[PDB]
Amino acid sequence: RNAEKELLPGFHQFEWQPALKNVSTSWDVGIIDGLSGWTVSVDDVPADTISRRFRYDVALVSALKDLEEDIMEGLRERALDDSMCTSGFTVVVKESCDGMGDVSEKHGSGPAVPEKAVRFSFTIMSISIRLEGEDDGITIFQEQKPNSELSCRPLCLMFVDESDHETLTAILGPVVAERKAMMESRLIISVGGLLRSFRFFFRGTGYDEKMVREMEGLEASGSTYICTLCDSTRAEASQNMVLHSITRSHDENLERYEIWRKNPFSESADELRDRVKGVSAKPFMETQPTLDALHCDIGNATEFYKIFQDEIGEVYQKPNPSREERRRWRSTLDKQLRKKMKLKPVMRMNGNYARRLMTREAVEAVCELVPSEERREALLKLMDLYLQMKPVWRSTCPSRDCPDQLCQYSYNSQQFADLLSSMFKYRYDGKITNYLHKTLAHVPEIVERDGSIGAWASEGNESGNKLFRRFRKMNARQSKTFELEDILKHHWLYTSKYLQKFMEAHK
Amino acid sequence: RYEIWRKNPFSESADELRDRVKGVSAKPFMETQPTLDALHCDIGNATEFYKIFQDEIGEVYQKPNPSREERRRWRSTLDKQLRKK
Amino acid sequence: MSLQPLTAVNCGSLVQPGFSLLDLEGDVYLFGQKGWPKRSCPTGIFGVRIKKGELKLRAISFSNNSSYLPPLRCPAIAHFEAQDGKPECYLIHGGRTPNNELSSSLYMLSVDSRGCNRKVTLRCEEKELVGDVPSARYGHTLSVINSRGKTACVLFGGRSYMPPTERTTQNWNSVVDCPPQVYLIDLEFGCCTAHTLPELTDGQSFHVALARQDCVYFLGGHILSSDCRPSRLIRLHVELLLGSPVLTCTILHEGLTITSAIASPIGYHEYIIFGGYQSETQKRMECTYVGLDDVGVHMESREPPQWTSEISHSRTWFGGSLGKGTALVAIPSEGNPTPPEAYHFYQVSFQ
Amino acid sequence: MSLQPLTAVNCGSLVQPGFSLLDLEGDVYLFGQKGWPKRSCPTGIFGVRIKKGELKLRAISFSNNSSYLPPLRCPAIAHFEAQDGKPECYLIHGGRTPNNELSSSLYMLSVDSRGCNRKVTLRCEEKELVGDVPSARYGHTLSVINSRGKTACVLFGGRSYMPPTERTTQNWNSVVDCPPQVYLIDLEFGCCTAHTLPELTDGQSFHVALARQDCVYFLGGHILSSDCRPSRLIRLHVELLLGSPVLTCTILHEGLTITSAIASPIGYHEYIIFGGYQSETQKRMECTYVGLDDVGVHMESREPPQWTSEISHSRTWFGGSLGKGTALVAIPSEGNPTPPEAYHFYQVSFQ
DNA sequence: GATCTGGCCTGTCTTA
DNA sequence: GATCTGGCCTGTCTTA
């Protein structure tokens, strides 16, 4: 109990310069109730939510103070002289926030709280160096397996329904405030014996599309304006596919809201929503214009599942299928995927059944179902196209691991879209799933910009959710008051490197 | 009892036959000691008094025919109270 | 003096713990809703119709020349009555944005056109405020006054977030009563005058204001410093003269102790205070009647409609006044699974 | 030749993989309900009606005279047609009850009264059997023969549980082909004679029997010992002469390889054989027409209905014949969430 | 009579 | 025209 006092936040001393805005200077603060001073008067908007959060900065300096070991061994490996050139660091932090349903409430005392729980976390992707000047920025430490639940650092733990915005922004407000206040100031830590300075670059990449949309003020999730990154409408992204240019970014969305509200040109609702390209709400958080890998995979997988379902019977031959046949087609498709490929039907489709489904030999068991020969060849060819473009955004860093697929991705997508609007048009005339568009349009651009994608995936969040369930049973207190406190703490302890180092046992 | 239900030597009608065999429509595959279960007894009576409380909040025996709405309402004030205290 | 139980029919996910009801030119419209507006009705304002127990909510569409509004939580509504040149006005300021913030911008909301079949287009108009602007706030009250014979407006009370210098991410969500200065806002132009009060040594909130004939009565409200709910009612009297809008005030001995009260107009100026919370736990059941005359405020209790045991035991309640001595109340509900409707409703009427 | 999809409407939870359709006096009755009879219909038998694609099951009600029957799964059904004394009978023996045991008791099922309104009461008369009782078995078949002019029945084939010596609670649930001895059962009296023949080396299972004019043809069944599906067609000729039912037999050149076949009578004695399976893995799609005459049985394949890809790819399938060249087939279905109804249906018809 | 607009249902889509 | 039966649809109960 007194052994981990170090590993938790609110231990190691640190300071910012210039001093942070609107944040206290006390560095000893540990787990804080995230309500953060709600007066909880009956007369006001009630406080229905329990939460716990580290003060963001403290969680950071503890994470990094825990990476002290690996950045010193890294520095030594580089043979970059450790004592000199210590002030020019650059820290790139991936943060992610995702919700979770069906968490049963506790009888407890109070207050009343909804079932759903939201887990706000982050992970340190890399830490690099620049000075004296000259060369670039220089990597030192880079997380080798970001997707692992081993490194995801929980920060804010809440019981909140994703749907209510009021409360979500009420609790996550302070956290965002320390972030945008923090981007300006550089950190000072005492590490390796010496006082050194860090710059932080925050990329929230891990959010699912519905959350990105809802914090950015967009209309979710099936609205005429599909691309979070582009201004394209539904039908406009129907005719043209492979050619698009990323526009949507934070400041632009803010200014676009101020237009939507203030409304100087006095257009009617329809036309106004046309002018701002569908920003109906003031976003609060800033989010990198990037694409989640996981949901992308699941989206395309379910679209191909649907295409399969339609090819089993003949849809383009008779355009208006009965409902009974709709189920009959599902029944024989899942029959097949059981007898071959060893797969069983799902309600919501997990990404694992997406990895079994996406393979070519999986498309083989279905190719046998469709009577037509050229159709049989068409969807097969489609799937091989998809296998060729998938590792680009799935793999961590395609610039090395899979170069040729990357360079050919634009052309390959062109080919793909052509084949769709060619034989499948009936199902893509005026409608395209958000992800098929996103994956056929903005991928080469973002891979060119971030350098890589899928390393930034929601997976490194999400997975962590598993823990949150077991840590809510095994390691819980258990009563409503203390429970989030000790889950959060124990989670933090699970994530720390210092311990995992020990548990490697050095070969 | 089952053998009576099947053979049915008295050529008696179904409605009344069921009375004679007193509820046995099938051949039993296992012997269980004629004994009560504690747990589901507790849950059965618990949920019963939950129901009686619920009907008792509003006045049920004065007006015998409540709607779906006043019932759901009764449930709401009931649970709100049980939580509150 | 009675209550009919109301069904929320479809779509009861809109109504939220604080919100507002705008009664202008017949039908009353609901204002404010959970989260950000949804495409179904992007405006954020619904017309409300109550027929045969059914509570039905309809989409309202703004005029092209009008600004669009965020679903404010607990703003200060001032209903400005018909006169030159443009009836009927609703002054809304400034509430709390669903994205959690305080909006300091004042809006003038009104009626535009109809029907052709039963459709009322509306127009919202921002007003630039030349100031000496009011600090962004919620729970404050605003009221329309006329003196000799020009018209201005009076803004006071409510809370605001901790001062931006002293607000720490731990104490972020903490909130303090804004300083006791009254803001006299001319409708046009946007001149906003801030005025100190020797008689008021403290600020307050949720104080229901009743304004008649160049005089404004502030009924008791929750004060956050001493956590007391003063029985004392506070009257003020505004002097508008060229070119100085000088302001006097006075304390009234005894009045009702209430917070978050619903004022439902009945007679000409006679509103019944429909109640609210008397203390931090117990909620006022007693329904009270209020006339306002030049002599003074005339206050008589009235026999409250008998409450169903549900609303009598309800932890909290809220609502709005549909006017014409008719008002709405809402009771939060529990069960499992979700009802879905988080709020049961009742409609109360006088006589 | 045609097939069309059937919606099972309400209550499609009654059909289990083996079951039996009893076609007598027009309307056909489903039999072999899943599990034990539920007092929704305590009888256990269902009138089945197929209208405009809808498959509806009605609850039959036994006569007071009748014994009640357990939902046997895979019994030997022998239709005995109309003549003196009391037409027309369906001989059911013995199948296996929803608990695991084999009845080994013959039941005679007959029609009784109608309607009043579209109602058919039935009566089951169990008959005692002295012998030389038939060993308890299932999957066996039974047939009706008439020799000058006495009517008797022929009972042969089928699996049974391992005898109570080899019987072991590890091997308890194993089955084995019961020995090849034909049982001649007089309808009344209950004398059951057991004969064997050198021509019959082994016992079979699910071998579809056709019976006409004192001659019985067993199609190739499934032999469990050598695991063959004999293409040898079996014939036997019985004649009852006082006081012994003398019996003979012959093997045939060519016979079908199929197990669990569905025989739908169309012509006088001409049947359409659908077949359930060619082999262990792969089911038979081919439809065949089988007529029979005094000279012999003559086989002609007719073009099978074009199968929907589902039933062509379905691992298992079954059904029954509604008679009059009309039959029902059933396809198990995997879907999630549960359909719930487990079986799609198709109605098939000839010419 | 017969528009309008909304209203609900339905209808598929589209996200989680 | 009007029974009877069975029907569905409702509609409550009891165990789970």
Ligand SMILES: [Zn+2]
């Ligand atoms: Zn785009």
